Subunit: 412 residues, 4 copies
């Protein structure tokens, strides 16, 4: 099997497979072959998960996710009934990076931190499937869970340049991620104080990253779902003015550092979304205030040029939903976005809030009433059994039963 | 300072200090010095934490803790009012070891895992303290939180022989642990089957580990709180017969693997309690079935031979508390154990149940009712604000405001 | 594919494939399937490398390796024309474990350490291949190097029980190891003083680890080459007397610890070799003194019972070869052992001695004659270019050209 | 001690101590205290190492170091008589990063990789001092080695913006680094093609990083030696024209990326050297061609405005020293440079060349002569025993002696 033969084979697949419908690549298949090496190592979960995610995203009304920061959190989301897992960069920074430090969301943690948390979840999901399968329960049977839910992972802005982006994608696929998202800001050069806020890079550079992320997915031989995030809705600063796509938004003012001020909002958002559309699989306008009217406008704006383009949407945990929206709007919210084209929706900091509220809640009681506090939680756990909560049986949950099986198999 | 002069001053320490009242070392100060190396690196956190944990242990009616598996979990425990943090090896095995796999409690994960998580908690707590200080709150002010609560870490049975034990203790101290506990089983050779279970090591070997654990502490130069765990209440197997301390409890029988069956119960527990009492600072009989009668008997038995000697108790999270107790005994459970001398008490798997319930409860709602399940959580958070819950202000919690102060100091 | 069908294909394979000729599994194909899980994840390197390693040790006169502790060491070994890579646990303990400590050889480092290094080597070997390929060179072309040389890994005594070994084997395979060895001592309890040395475990427990290793290899779905090591030649202690295979060698004495003293040498080693042979692909009797006489007796001892059994041999880096053997004996030593059936041979600590001598030497002259000492080293490197040494082009070697390719493919 | 008193004591230290003569701090003692937290944690090794390095640098004719990528290498460097250790980022990228990947030099590895290696080297040295001390040797015996040589570590360009540099400097300090350098390029955005090369950042930004670095040293409470590197001799691109200091060098041309082409050489190097001098302890103009002539002009240009400013020089390992310089020039090179003010000098990739050549040379021979090749190395190792090479007694070298002493201390 020659280089030429591998390239034609690859090229036909981009042309034929409807997975790649309307997806531009600023590189040839001959390029992908040159950068493969001679042998291709298989990445099962990255491949199966990406295909599963693609299917779910295209057939289902929508898919909703919560941010997970541990394997257990992700597991309980699959057991609760969810179909995909979201890995927040913010959560990892905050409470689960390889540096073991607590950080804000400014790309401070080491570049391998999220891929290691992707592997954590997949290793936990792999264990649960093993526990299930070890107890005789086959696919088809009543109660059977597919524990290999697709993971979608935060890749920040690549942790530097195109090569960092390229390597970050690879780390993700190796760790078993089904989807990855690259944003178009520099959170490492955020201007502080009044007149500050987020800082964007040129469309030129955001595109070069996505090109890098797709090159990396191809070289790895996985059809990973690529998500393009834009921060243009609120980002009113840009590092440079060279890209003609961005000049229309310049207010003409500069800052001490040399950034150009820009006019934020929907129009800036749209020009990014449109520029990223040919290269990404989903587009995502990062929002702080959840608003269906805004969402409809953005959706329509993108759909004018790319009809039926899959979108994604993050529901802010910071926003006060009861104060600003009535129960009917809150209750219908995700369904309405689903109609619009927002096929992937998620709460980024779900796990943070859950973890942090649970423990504070228990502890405050514990400090006051001691063991009675714990029983409140325990009874709550028993009440949850009905709905599918097996973790009360703590030993079986971590895989005690499975490893006994292993020891019994060897000692016999 | 010469080796003689350093050895004198260390012995003088062991004879002088009331911290070392009642405690036996099977080695000389000359030995500690011969193994220190020429210079003694300082471990701020380990030292101050042991000292704070000691005073607490000896003055408060008692000290109660809950298992934490992330910095966030610990951090809330301090904000909740708790004065100490417990670090389960079960929970790390289950969801926070550096291998990133889900294991059962059998020392399967890599030996540096718990110390890694000790270091996390202390990194987070250090960040909690920096935020508070950078906001201009001084100690003595209202609402000021001492974030540096001492950590009591689980060292299993040292992960091998005496050297593994020795090296693990150094890892714990370097991370900044304030207490470490060692147990007298081999979970690595737990027997499966009807005639199986936990398996003890000779008193001789358990004491061997305790010596190594304390020698570790002295070489690091920290008065670390050492805790000895016997599993001799339920464990009915032992690997060997050599120790005369253990022969009285044998039943003459031998298993296939060459272990010796023993008669489990309070008396076996007791002999191990008495054996370890000269070497460890607190003695802990691990129990599966919480019982005030049992507790009081084991309290009186040890106190007859070592009066005043501190103790600790694990309040099993798997046991059905209401099923087997009335609210009044439950509500006065820890209270009572204090009086008996159980100055350190904890729920090993508190963090597991806290983490795993919340995410499930949330996801199950989120699955069926989307955003309104998150709203239910968000409203609970707002209620907890009065009681000290600051996590709602998520940006400030993770250090955003602290790191903004770092950026403003540089760029001005 | 149903469970019974899967077990059918697997069982038949063990009977049909000459790879498994002479090999006994103390467990069924149904057990393997039961413990796999629902999906099998692929491990390309582990598989291809295990298939390649097997081909070499059966078809070549003998395969020889040197111990490597970084990826560069390994990368060079392959460019020098060696066909296999050895990964010492001693070298890892000493200079390349994840604890970052300098340690002696008593299984003191974290259990995940050697896999981390096996993975590092493969990452490097993957990069040498990507470079070669990216430059246009194809297989068959003059000069083309096969950079995927298989790695045989030190798993010590498995760091505990059968689960610990199971898991380490899985880490070895996941990291891309092609061979793994397990020794029958318990280094963790090495007796000190005159009346001491290595302690053996019962033949029963050794075989239990070997079966554990095989089970894992089957559960991962890789035909990994399993090497059983005996320390019975020197070891004159044993932990327990239950196994009838060991009783013939007991003296009847017992140490303070409870160990039983035994009669070391060729007879004890053979009883172990013979006991392990059914379970392992290679048998290894560890020696301190190299001796062709001893080798032949052991080879013939094994071969009477197991004709043509593949054996492996360690050539001590500490033995004074020139003082005790003449040059012609030294020159033929590995060829001679090959004909006896030692098909895999290595020098455990070749990298330790390479690395430490080369730096000391450089540093010693540099401290006295500064840049003149480095020019000596640089001039040696120039002479090596004739012989295949490419690392003078230091940029290309680490992949500067490859990543400039990736930069160029994304940009323009 | 109130905040006011702390600030005053710290301010007095800056105005009083000669260590800080001619060092500008773009911030106040009040600021350092605000960001300290409520309790400073001690970092013995970083503090003592910094002070030691400061004395050596101000008193020796010069100090010279080689690049070390393992603890063993630094250990041999100290045994051979070198007075400090250098830690190359290039080397860590290529063979020692925590990602486990072979990388070129463009800040691809995870940001914590170099601190981890600084921590490894310190652990090895710490162990060496333990072995020595446990053998009875005291300071001021004939041959007593001070194994705690200072480490000067590569921080590249801080892996992002001011806060990334801040955090990296803190990681260095915690690992026990004595010196740290930061360069003024964005390696992560290297221009490819014939019209490309390295890319400088604005003077203004390089100083912000240096300011950040110093703020970190002060917050950590150690007098860490801060080196400022400039790539302005060969770099002919810059990200922006915002800085008046840089404008003079612009050729008015621009690239597709929107970078500004500059005029490289001594003049642009001087403007950076002068710009950084007030914030750095040493100044380093990185050069590709070792030229004494150049080194002189540069030294003079700097000392014109900052008399007696300590400089540092990297001695290129790629340069063909013999083809270009006669042996007497090669011999006088580090002495001559020292006489100009270059008080820290180092060969960056010494470790890479020593490790790769040695293993290639051993392995090439081993492929063709087997053991006779290893015996050449072993004989070579015996000859260096005269000179201080202790590694042939290999069990002692890695601490078998020390840990035996510990086991015997425990078992007695």
């Amino acid at each position: 099997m020659s280089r030429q033969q591998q390239a034609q084979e690859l090229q036909k697949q981009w042309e034929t497979d409807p997975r790649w419908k309307g997806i531009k690549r600023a590189f040839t298949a001959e390029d992908v072959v040159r950068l493969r090496g001679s042998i291709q190592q298989e990445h099962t979960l990255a491949k199966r998960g990406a295909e599963k995610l693609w299917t779910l995203i295209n057939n289902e009304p929508f898919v909703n996710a919560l941010g997970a920061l541990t394997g257990n959190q992700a597991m309980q989301q699959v057991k609760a009934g969810l179909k995909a897992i979201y890995l927040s960069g913010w959560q990892v920074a905050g409470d689960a990076n390889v540096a073991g430090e607590m950080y804000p969301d400014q790309s401070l943690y080491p570049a391998n931190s999220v891929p290691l948390v992707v592997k954590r979840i997949n290793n936990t999901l792999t264990r649960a499937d093993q526990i299930q399968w070890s107890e005789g329960k086959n696919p088809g049977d009543e109660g059977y869970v597919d524990f290999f839910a697709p993971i979608v992972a935060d890749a920040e802005a690549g942790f530097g340049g195109v090569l960092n982006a390229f390597e970050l994608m690879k780390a993700m696929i190796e760790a078993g991620a089904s989807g990855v998202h690259f944003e178009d800001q520099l959170a490492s050069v955020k201007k502080c104080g009044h007149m500050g806020g987020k800082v964007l890079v040129p469309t030129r550079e955001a595109v070069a990253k996505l090109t890098a992320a797709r090159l990396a997915a191809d070289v790895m031989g996985t059809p990973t779902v690529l998500v393009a995030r834009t921060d243009a809705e609120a980002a009113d600063l840009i590092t440079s003015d060279i890209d003609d796509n961005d000049k229309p938004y310049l207010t003409g003012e500069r800052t001490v550092e040399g950034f150009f001020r820009t006019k934020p909002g929907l129009e800036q958002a749209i020009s990014r979304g449109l520029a990223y559309a040919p290269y990404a699989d989903l587009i995502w306008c990062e929002t702080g205030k959840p608003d269906l009217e805004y969402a409809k406008k953005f959706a329509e704006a993108i759909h004018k040029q790319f009809p039926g383009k899959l979108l994604s949407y993050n529901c802010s945990p910071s926003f006060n939903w009861k104060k600003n929206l009535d129960d009917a709007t809150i209750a219908k919210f995700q369904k309405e976005l689903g109609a619009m084209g927002y096929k992937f929706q998620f709460i980024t900091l779900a796990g943070f809030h859950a973890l942090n509220y649970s423990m504070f809640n228990l502890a405050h009681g514990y400090a006051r009433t001691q063991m009675s506090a714990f029983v409140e939680l325990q009874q709550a756990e028993f009440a949850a059994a009905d709905k599918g909560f097996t973790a009360v049986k703590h030993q079986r949950e971590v895989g005690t039963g499975y490893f006994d099986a292993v020891t019994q198999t060897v000692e016999r």
